[PDB]
């Protein structure tokens, strides 16, 4: 499922991301934008052979189980599959653990590189929230 910009913000907000660990709703929408382009089914192979999954491209080395990542962890105790469904619950829940991990939203390289310090409020401009 490809979410619309405000439709993702709404779902995100309903699942308690709005200001989670201090990161306002605009940051999470910006990060989704650049990680998956609002598509739940986005996957991408990292060079180490782990795979990034979902709206927020959550990595299998640490956070989910895909059975094809030698030496990895499944710290969100989910199949990476869960991160690709229309229902963003698993994704949001697993984002919450990642962003709590000590490094904040920097855990997402695209957010650091493309969202950090930008007018992130733009991403929620004009949404019924």
The resolution in angstroms reads 2.6
In the annotation, is 52 catalytic? yes
Q: How far apart are CA 50 and CA 62, in angstroms?
A: 9
DSSP 79: B
- Residue ranges of domains in the chain: 1-129
Residues 6+ positions from 102 with CB-CB distance below 8 Å: none
Q: How far apart are CA 31 and CA 112, in angstroms?
A: 9
* Options 7, 18, 35, 48, the catalytic residue: 35
Q: Strand, helix or coil at 65?
A: strand
In this structure, the number of other CB atoms found within 10 A of the CB of residue 102 comes to 7
Determine if residue 101 is labeled as part of a ligand binding site: yes
Q: How many CA atoms, within 13 angstroms, populate the side-chain half-sphere of residue 102?
A: 0
Tell me which method was used to determine the 3D structure: X-ray
Angle at 50 between CA 44 and CA 51, to 5 degrees: 30
User: Which CATH number describes the domain made up of 1-129?
Assistant: 1.10.530.10
Give the H/E segment covering residue 59.
Answer: strand 58-59
In the annotation, is 7 catalytic? no
* Options 7, 52, 66, 119, the catalytic residue: 52
């Amino acid at each position: 499922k490809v979410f619309g910009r405000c439709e993702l913000a709404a779902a995100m907000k309903r699942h308690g991301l709005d200001n989670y660990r201090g990161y306002s709703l605009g940051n999470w929408v910006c990060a989704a934008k650049f990680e998956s382009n609002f598509n739940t089914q986005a996957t991408n192979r990292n060079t180490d052979g782990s795979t990034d999954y979902g709206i927020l491209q959550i990595n299998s080395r640490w956070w989910c189980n895909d059975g094809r990542t030698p030496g990895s962890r499944n710290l969100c105790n989910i199949p990476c599959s869960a991160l690709l469904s229309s229902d963003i619950t698993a994704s949001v829940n697993c984002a919450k653990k990642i962003v709590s991990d000590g490094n904040g939203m920097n855990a997402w390289v695209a957010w650091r590189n493309r969202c950090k310090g930008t007018d992130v409020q733009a991403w929620i401009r004009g949404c019924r929230l």
